Amino acid sequence: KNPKSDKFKVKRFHHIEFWCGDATNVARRFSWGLGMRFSAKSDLSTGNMVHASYLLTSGDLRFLFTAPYSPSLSAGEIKPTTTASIPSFDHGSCRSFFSSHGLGVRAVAIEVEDAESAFSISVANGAIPSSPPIVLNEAVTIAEVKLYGDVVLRYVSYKAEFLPGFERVEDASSFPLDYGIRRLDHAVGNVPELGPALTYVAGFTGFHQFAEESGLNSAVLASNDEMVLLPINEPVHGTKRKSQIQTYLEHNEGAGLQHLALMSEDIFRTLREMRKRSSIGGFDFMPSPPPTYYQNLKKRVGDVLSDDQIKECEELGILVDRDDQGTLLQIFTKPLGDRPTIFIEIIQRVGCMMYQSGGCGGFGKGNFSELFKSIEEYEK
Amino acid sequence: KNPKSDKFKVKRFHHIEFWCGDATNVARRFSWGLGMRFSAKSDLSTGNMVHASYLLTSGDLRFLFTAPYSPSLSAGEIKPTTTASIPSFDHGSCRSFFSSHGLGVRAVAIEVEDAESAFSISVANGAIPSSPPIVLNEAVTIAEVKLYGDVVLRYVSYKAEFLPGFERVEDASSFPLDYGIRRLDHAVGNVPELGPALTYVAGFTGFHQFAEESGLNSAVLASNDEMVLLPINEPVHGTKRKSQIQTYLEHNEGAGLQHLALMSEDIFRTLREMRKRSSIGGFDFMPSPPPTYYQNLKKRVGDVLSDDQIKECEELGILVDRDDQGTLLQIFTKPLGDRPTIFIEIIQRVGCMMYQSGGCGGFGKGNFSELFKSIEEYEK
Ligand SMILES: Cc1c(C(=O)C2=C(O)CCCC2=O)ccc2c1c(=O)n(CCCc1ccccc1)c(=O)n2C
Ligand SMILES: Cc1c(C(=O)C2=C(O)CCCC2=O)ccc2c1c(=O)n(CCCc1ccccc1)c(=O)n2C
Ligand SMILES: [Co+2]
Ligand SMILES: [Co+2]
């Protein structure tokens, strides 16, 4: 049952913005590790005396990396006279965010038909304002409201290239890397209490709960066409193994974005390319499941994957689960930075063709039981 | 005239420590861009609840990357009970340093015979204490005094593997990258006033001035065997082109480390390997000199370099200058991070063999005039 109760019209995920200490070094690491191209910049070379912001792209996926300059560079400025290309940026907010949480996602940005209306409707329906709507160069409107912890849901709307004031990067600096990642599938938050978080967000968006003992309870909020998916996790305290959600909240200093799930058009090639680079500047992956997990894969997905495609999953460490509607291939990186907080999931879905409907195959929660069983069975 | 007036005994450069927001992402970028191996770590996996520190090595060059965790992780700790592996670390000092300067060098570490004595003698001779001597595991002594701005000269001494509490990285995580960089040749500071900076540092070290209109005045302080070299720059105000030193001080919020010069055993291979990676996560280089610069190279270094070796300099953008004692090959990267502050120089020296004596060939100040002339001559 999808009641299609969105209180405004939302199209798709637009971009994810990381707040960093040095946007240059994070963006270069991410670009090599994930195969994303340098697409746009807004910094001193473009006249921005406030923040440095570098955009990476792969397919429709857009990662923005932003860090503050010395406030002394822009001391004569006031908001009306700002050189910032993102008007919601604030030196003090960014330094406090990064000091408190370390490297992580500040904004989950979705594209809307009209950012002003979406902001107005949101706050009228309980959203806590963060940045009022601002129209940039009579071309793009952006607005922000609180999502959970210190993360904002950013609304972006275009009348008719990323943002005004950003410049497209010179080809010489822009090497056409691509490992097959194509778009953002879902973005997941960790909170101390799931219930109030769900009521708050679903309260101001109209998003509905998407149809779905290992450290968490979870639920998924979705847009009308279920292309925007926002799962939220809480910890289950009192187990024997400590909750990974609780560990997150402790090292993150509270609620925040846990993982970004990036859809690949060819997960086998994406994982081959990322695993080649794991020890030369890229991203590490979580430990692989035992061969027991893959021997048991034939009995569950042997209808969808060949034996050659299943052993290819085994050499790459890919996990597989299944809904009644589709099949899911997934794998998780190790944490993206110093703290055991944010990580990335690489994903590709098969089935539910009509295009492919969103969430086809679920989110892989059945892989918790399958991994534990496979692990214990492997031991004995 | 080398009066050999060192007030204690110093061996060589030991390591350079960067203070970062996220030590993981800076270290991975540097490792790929410069060809340095992950050699040691001190972080949560080693029991350090205070800071994350990752060591990269190439030859005798050691780069340390350190960032603070949430103070909440170590709130019950006091200095006697600390889990920090570097006892001079302080959450507040590091966050304030990085907020003020951005990514840059906190410590220039030199190896001494006895760090306690070197600290005592230094402060008795005018040095401003920063961190008193501390003996780690009855094995290593470290101490720190102020050098310029917020950079410290760190003394390290070993009775008889980087530091106690650091672990050697698992081979699987440690990919044997190497582009030919072998050691730190010199480390350069930018200050507002050269005179007082020189008197202060030479005052407490006993270092002597090493034998030597484009934006700076400079002078070089050296150890007894002239293996430790510490040039210092000041701006020359009132030119037509603005001083790069003054631009540094403005964006850095005052005095600090301008560049690190890394000696290569094969600069041609180092530059080939680094230039291959410039647009895929590595380091960019300053613009190359015009062909005019290289046509004029034959008349000045045609005795030392073949025509094949000279055109190889031309394809890599390498600069060449000469003392009366030796010849210098050098090239400069673009800034290492967001701000136009710190950069890196790659260097290789030829001549003055006895081993090679330090500073053989100078520091390339004659390349300021040669580049300008070559540039103007190229135009017309
Ligand atoms: C995150 C995830 C998902 C996932 O994507 C997902 C959502 O999209 C929405 C609904 C809830 C949810 O969980 C699916 C399966 C997963 C994991 C996962 O993290 N781990 C590793 C667990 C060890 C661990 C150690 C340390 C820190 C974190 C974790 C798994 O083993 N499985 C099977
Ligand atoms: C730094 C250097 C050295 C050098 O190493 C050195 C020392 O070791 C010690 C003594 C003084 C000194 O200068 C030598 C030659 C150099 C440069 C250099 O920076 N530039 C680029 C200038 C444009 C520029 C733009 C923006 C920001 C900075 C600079 C050059 O053109 N030349 C020829
Ligand atoms: Co997921
Ligand atoms: Co130099």
Q: Considering only CA atoms, which residue is closest to atom 26 of ligand 2?
A: B244
Residue B194 φ/ψ, nearest 5 degrees: -65, -45
Is residue A214 in contact with ligand 1, taking CB distance under 6 Å? no
Q: Which of A205, A29, A241 is nearest to A121 (CA)?
A: A205
Q: Are B105 and B8 in contact (CB under 8 A)?
A: no
CA distances from B41 to A161, A285, B68, B105, B169 (A): 42, 19, 14, 18, 7
Q: Please name the method used to determine this structure.
A: X-ray
Nearest alpha-carbon partner for A6 in A233, A203, A212: A203
Chain breaks in chain A (C to N over 2.5 A) after: 160, 212, 354
- Coil, helix or strand for A221? strand
Q: Which of residues 105-164 of A touch B (CB under 8 A)?
A: none
Q: Of B113, B111, B108, which Cα lies nearest the Cα of B145?
A: B108
Give the separation between CA A281 and CA B341, rounded to whole angstroms.
23
Distance CA B214, CA B239 (A): 8
B77 has binding-site annotation: no
Q: How far apart are CA A259 and CA A266, in angstroms?
A: 20
Q: Give the separation between CA B273 and CA B262, rounded to whole angstroms.
A: 15
The answer to whether B27 touches B198, Cβ cutoff 8 Å, is no
Q: What is the resolution of this structure in A?
A: 2.0
**Strands B51-58 and B37-42, bridge-based pairing:** antiparallel
Alpha carbons A77 and A81: distance in angstroms, whole number: 6
Query: Between A and B, how many CB-CB pairs are < 8 A?
Result: 128
Smallest CA-to-CA distance from A210 within A174, A236, A185, A184 is with A185
Spatial neighbors of B162 by CB under 8 A, at least 6 apart, are: B15, B39, B40, B55, B62
First CA to last CA across chain B, in angstroms? 43
Dist CA A280 CA B58 (whole Å)? 14
- Output the known binding site of A: 186, 259, 345
CB distance A307 to A314 below 8 Å: no
Q: Is A272 helix (H, G, I), strand (E, B) or coil?
A: helix
- Chain-centroid distance of CA B138 in Å reads 29
Quick one: DSSP state of residue A45? G
Is B259 labelled as part of a ligand binding site? Answer: yes
Contacts (Cβ under 8 Å, ≥6 apart) of A46 = A85, A165, A166, A167
Q: Which residues of B165-192 are buried (b: 16+ CB within 10 A; e: fewer)?
A: bbeebeeeebeebbbbbbbbbbbbbbbe
DSSP B161-190: --STT-EEPPGGG-----SSEEEEEEEEEE
B263 touches chain A (CB under 8 A): no
Helix (H) or strand (E) holding A351: strand A343-351
**Residue B106, class by beta-carbon neighbours within 10 Å (0-12 exposed, 13-18 middle, 19+ buried)?**
buried
C-alpha–C-alpha distance, residues A349 and A263, integer Å: 8
* Residue pair A9/A112 in contact by the 8 Å Cβ criterion: yes
Residue that has been written with the tokens 């790659």 in this structure: B346
Angle, nearest 10°, between helix axes A267-276 and A307-316? 30
Residue nearest to atom 1 of ligand 1 (CA): A259
* CA B18 to chain CA centroid, nearest Å: 10
Interface test with B, best of A29, A54, A288, A343 (most B CBs within 10 A): A29
- Which residue's entry shows tokens 């002594």? B141
User: How many whole angstroms separate alpha carbon A149 and alpha carbon A190?
Assistant: 9
Instruction: Enumerate residues 6+ apart whose C-beta is below 8 A from A57.
Output: A36, A37, A39, A63
Pairing assessment for the beta strands B326-332 and B319-322 based on DSSP bridges? antiparallel
Assess contact for A45 and B284: CB atoms under 8 A: no
Q: Yes or no: say if B40 and B169 are a contact pair by the CB < 8 Å rule.
A: yes
Cβ atoms A236, A217 nearer than 8 A: yes
CB atoms closer than 10 angstroms to residue B195:
12
The pairing of strands A229-235 and A181-190 is parallel
Among A1, A183, A18, A13, which residue's Cα sits nearest to residue A86?
Answer: A18
Please enumerate in sequence order all residues whose Cβ is within 8 A of that of B40, keeping only pairs 6 or more positions apart, or say none. B54, B55, B161, B162, B163, B166, B167, B168, B169
Cα–Cα distance for residue pair B147/B123, rounded to 1 Å: 12
Tell me which chain A residues have a C-beta less than 8 angstroms from the C-beta of B338. 22-24, 43, 52, 67, 69
In the DSSP assignment, the letter for residue B132 is E
What is the H or E stretch that residue A13 is in? Answer: strand A10-19
3-state helix, strand, coil in chain A (%, to 5): 30, 35, 40
Residues of chain A contacting residue B18, judged by C-beta atoms under 8 Å apart:
none
Cα three-residue angle A111-A113-A118, rounded to 5 degrees: 85
Chain B (73-92) residues lying within 8 Å, Cβ to Cβ, of chain A:
73
Task: Match 């005239």 to its residue by tokens.
Answer: B1
Tokens representing residue A377 in the block:
């069975």
Tokens of A177: 């890397």
Q: CB neighbours of B116 closer than 8 A, spacing ≥ 6?
A: B133, B135, B141, B143, B157
Q: Would you mind telling me the total number of residues written for chain A in this entry?
A: 380
Mark yes or no for CB contact B21/A103 under 8 Å.
Answer: yes
Residues with Cβ within 8 Å of B268's Cβ and at least 6 positions away in sequence, in order, are B312, B316, B318
Name the CA radius of gyration of chain B, rounded: 21
Torsion sign (Cα): B336, B218, B146, B4: positive
| Contact status of B99 with chain A (Cβ, < 8 Å) | yes
Bridge-based pairing state of the strands B10-19 and B61-68? parallel
Would you state the torsion angle of the CA atoms of residues A115, A233, A352, A323, taken in this order, to the nearest 10 degrees?
Answer: -170
Angle A65-A201-A350 from CA coordinates, rounded to 5°? 70
Please name every residue paired with A216 in a beta bridge, in sequence order, or none if there are none.
A235
DSSP state of A149: T
Contacts (Cβ under 8 Å, ≥6 apart) of A81: none
Cα(B235)–Cα(B229) distance, integer angstroms: 20
Indicate the Cα dihedral angle A267, A273, A278, A283, nearest 10°: -50
Q: Do residues A55 and A63 lie in contact, with contact meaning Cβ atoms separated by under 8 Å?
A: yes
- In DSSP terms, A157 is beta-bridged to A141
Residues A338, B45 contacting (CB under 8 angstroms): no
Residues A264 and A241: their CA atoms lie apart, in Å, by 32
Greatest C-alpha distance within chain B: 69
Let me know: does A357 contact A332? Beta carbons within 8 Å.
no
Cα of B28 vs its chain's centroid, Å: 18
- What is the phi/psi pair of residue B168, to 5°? -75, 135
Which chain B residues are closer than 8 Å to A279 by Cβ? 38, 172-175
**Does the beta-carbon distance from A25 to B26 stay under 8 Å?**
yes
Tell me how crowded residue B82 is: count the other CB atoms within 10 A of its CB. 15
- Say if CB A325 and CB A88 are below 8 A apart: no
Residue pair A345/A334 in contact by the 8 Å Cβ criterion: no
Nearest CB among A29, A31, A69 relative to B339 is that of A69
Task: Say if B2 is an interface residue toward chain A (CB within 8 Å).
Answer: no
Residues with CB under 6 A from ligand 2: B 186, 188, 218, 231, 233, 244, 259, 261, 332, 345, 363-365, 367-368, 371
What is the tally of helices (H) and strands (E) in chain A?
Answer: 10, 17
Determine the angle formed by the axes of helices B267-276 and B307-316, rounding to 10 degrees. 30
What 3 state SS string does B283-350 have?
A: CCECCCCCHHHHHCCHHHHCCCCCHHHHHHHHHHCCEEEECCCEEEEEEEECCCCCCCCCEEEEEEEE
A194 vs A210: CA distance, rounded Å: 15
Which alpha helices (H) appear in chain B, and where do they start and end?
A: 23-34, 91-101, 115-124, 194-205, 244-252, 267-276, 291-295, 298-301, 307-316, 366-379
Q: Considering CB atoms only, which of B72, B103, B281 is closest to A29?
A: B281
Specify the long-range contacts of residues B142-146, CB closer than 8 Å, at least 24 apart: B142/B86, B142/B87, B142/B88, B142/B115, B143/B115, B143/B116, B143/B118, B143/B119, B144/B88, B144/B107, B144/B119, B145/B119, B145/B204
Question: Which of A26, A172, A177 lies at the smallest CB-CB distance from B280?
Answer: A177
What lies within 8 Å, CB to CB, of A10 at 6+ separation is A110, A111, A112, A118, A205, A223, A224, A228
Question: In a 3-state reduction of DSSP, which class is residue A201?
Answer: helix
Cα-Cα end-to-end distance for chain A: 43
Written as one letter, the residue type at B185 is: D
Residues followed by a break in chain B (C to N exceeding 2.5 Å) are 160, 212, 354
Alpha helices (H) along A267-379: 267-276, 291-295, 298-301, 307-316, 366-379
Say if CB B245 and CB B215 are below 8 A apart.
yes
Say how many C-beta atoms besides its own lie within 10 A of residue A237's C-beta. 10
A76: CB partners within 8 A, 6+ apart: none
- Tell me how far the alpha carbon of residue B223 lies from the centroid of ligand 2, in angstroms: 22
DSSP H or E segment with residue A195: helix A194-205
Strands (E) across A206-340 are located at 208-209, 216-222, 229-235, 256-264, 319-322, 326-332
CB count, 10 Å around CB of B78? 7
